[PDB]
């Protein structure tokens, strides 16, 4: 059960009632856009597509030879997969993310990977993302050079079902391809094959992941008092006057989740509203307890300009008891305790410390770090973001600001 | 040679001139503090220690059996090492960082690493950091159980030369130990054995790293016009009221540098000044070009409340030509160009786009990503930060805010 804790924000229950109408209206506006072509709300439906999932799995089982999975993708095509694979890799398959174009790290891959054991997954919604095309071209030459005509079995594409150069290339070469639904933006595509394909090779429980996401869907359409997504949307809305929103996760397995959320929040809400005003808060990634040794100092004695969300697990999947050390008595207070016990204590300690310093902070508790709880959390955050899009009167599903950089890049490349 | 570019900040030359006296005094105040025990300015001298790096090299050479290096450390004892090792690993030795206490990831390491090929490095300045003592306890049991009498050779300690439980433990057990100078704080310890030891096993050029840092020391003492650290200190100072400071690096090899800077900036300047006021800006990490697909959208159309610094390399160490692909004509504009050429184009393009959007942005150019250039950059930033400590009238070398969390943690664990 994903649980919202606002022990340090006493006025919330009342503020929720007060803003009930506003929230109901924001939700009404969003839902009224479904089915409308181009509204980009397809991410709502991904958790219900259990058939594509079985298809992804079948393909994975038909290719047990894969030892190295090279995902050539950037942004929405990489952050979700990275976040999920780092947390649920049970298969031992090695994942390499080409979410950049710096030559050296890529040459190292070409020189250390066995072509016969490598599967390249080119991922891009439009299929024309510059970085991905560049990386693909490099890996294609490599594949053909080492595998001859047997290269095609080593390249799988994930892109729009009909449009774009990747789709066309896949059709032309008879390559296996998965689809990113037309109405699903890259930023909201984590639960589509974008995330499902690599997770299948990672041997994660895809069914549990989607089960969690479907539960989040239920909370999104539930009565206000049970609509967690609307509650957290309100929390951010009520603190929209604070420029920074910190997303801190107390888990190493979920070390890549903060980055995924930063993109979700930043790219969705950093927009010009209906009123022509530049809006959006700055999402800042953090991990616990490591960031108690990097950013907490600032949260504690720096400006009171932040709204902090802490994601805390309540149980481990497999704990470890901290053993006694002869000759190291200074650590005796730890002996007998478990690592998760230390993890949880630090999370609770920091949560309190942040509140004691006057910062506005709340927590989202996860029963444990599992596909079910994480799928719930991610889908929840996508809903949160979508609702905020209504409350802030912006288009939460586009990204007008990234176009110029692409044009200027082409210019400098050509002349 | 590091290069500062302020092409999109036309009023900077006048501002530098006008604030000349202020900057000169900030520098004088900092330098006047040297010599005085407890000033925590030992990081200025690390580049001139031409004895310790030899000792580090000899130790490494005497242990060519290491295939896996497990660094148990957090915050200042982990970020510097991660940033450096990720950028300069030439040996292929696999590094594992215990900068957390979540049970599963650690259990995975205990079950997949070969004890005979593993070297454990416990790093902590105080020697009593909770997370590190817990991680060490666990690995100690593991080492003893699988290595017998030869366990001691697989554990090396990096801590204060005289204080703390780690120092005492190392002397009691006859373990190899390296020293973090008394006057060197954790977040300023990257060029001490904290970073030198792991870098040695990574096969990187330690000498070049310190030489580059020495160059930065020179710039810190140079005439104002040539003192890059005082110039960037001014830039951050002139935007001290803006809540956010983005640090974006256009390199994958340096993917861990932003995190290192965030701790350096946040923990040092997020303080209560001498007038009792809360000060400090929020450092936000970013990587190029991947963040053009995640955070740039917000920088482009969101609030103009940031000062952005872009770190851009000017040359690759080894480039890669993007090969033409038969059947992928939509990518022909990339054929013939190189990966670095693309990287550079995107960096310049984004730098300009950010300025076009009205954001206060500047760039720091590195000749290439090398120990020399990066050592220069890191030392430059430490000076920048120390100068800012004077300009903002705060103690940039302590961290009062993290104590409560530790106290509450012990309280929780006890009961």
From Swiss-Prot, chains A, B:
Its EC number is 5.3.1.9. Keywords: Cytoplasm, Gluconeogenesis, Glycolysis, Isomerase. GO terms for molecular function: carbohydrate derivative binding; glucose-6-phosphate isomerase activity; monosaccharide binding. CDD domains: SIS_PGI_1, SIS_PGI_2. GO terms for cellular component: cytosol. Belongs to the GPI family. Catalyzes the reversible isomerization of glucose-6-phosphate to fructose-6-phosphate. This is Glucose-6-phosphate isomerase. It comes from Thermus thermophilus (strain ATCC 27634 / DSM 579 / HB8).
């Amino acid at each position: 059960m994903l649980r919202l804790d606002t022990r340090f924000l006493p006025g919330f229950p009342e503020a929720l009632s007060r803003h009930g109408p506003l929230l109901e209206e924001a939700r009404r506006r969003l839902l009224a856009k479904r089915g409308e072509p181009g509204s980009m709300l397809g991410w709502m439906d991904l958790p219900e597509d259990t058939e594509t999932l079985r298809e992804v799995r079948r393909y994975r089982e038909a290719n047990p030879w894969v030892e190295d999975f090279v995902l050539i993708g950037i942004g929405g095509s990489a952050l979700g997969p990275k976040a999920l694979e780092a947390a649920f890799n049970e298969s031992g398959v090695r994942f390499h993310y080409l979410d950049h174009v710096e030559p050296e790290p890529i040459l190292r891959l070409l020189r250390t990977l066995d072509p016969r054991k490598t599967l390249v997954n080119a991922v891009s919604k439009s299929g024309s993302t510059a970085e991905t095309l560049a990386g693909l071209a490099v890996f294609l030459k490599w594949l053909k050079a080492h595998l001859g005509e047997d290269w095609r079995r080593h390249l799988v594409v994930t892109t729009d079902p009909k449009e774009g150069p990747l789709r066309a290339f896949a059709e032309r070469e008879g390559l296996k391809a998965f689809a990113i639904p037309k109405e699903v933006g890259g930023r909201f595509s984590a639960l589509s094959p974008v995330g499902l394909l690599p997770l299948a090779f990672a041997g994660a429980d895809l069914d549990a992941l989607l089960m969690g996401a479907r539960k989040a869907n239920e909370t999104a359409l539930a009565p206000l008092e049970e609509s967690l997504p609307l509650k957290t949307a309100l929390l951010l809305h009520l603190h929209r006057h604070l420029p920074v929103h910190v997303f801190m996760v107390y888990s190493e397995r979920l070390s890549h989740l903060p980055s995924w959320f930063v993109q979700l929040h930043d790219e969705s809400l950093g927009k010009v509203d209906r009123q022509g005003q530049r809006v959006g808060t700055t999402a800042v990634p953090a991990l616990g307890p490591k960031d108690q040794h990097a950013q907490v100092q600032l949260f504690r004695e720096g400006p009171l300009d932040k709204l902090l969300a802490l994601v805390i697990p309540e149980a481990p999947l497999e704990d470890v008891e901290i053993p006694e050390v002869e000759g190291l008595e200074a650590a005796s207070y730890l002996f007998g305790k478990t690592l998760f016990q230390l993890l949880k204590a630090e999370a609770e300690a920091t949560y309190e410390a942040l509140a004691e310093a006057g910062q506005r902070v709340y927590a989202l508790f996860l029963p444990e770090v599992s596909p079910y709880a994480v799928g719930w959390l991610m889908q929840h955050l996508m809903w949160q973001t979508a609702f905020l899009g209504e409350l802030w009167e912006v288009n939460a599903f586009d990204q007008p600001g990234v176009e110029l950089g692409k044009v200027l890049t082409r210019k400098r490349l050509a002349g």
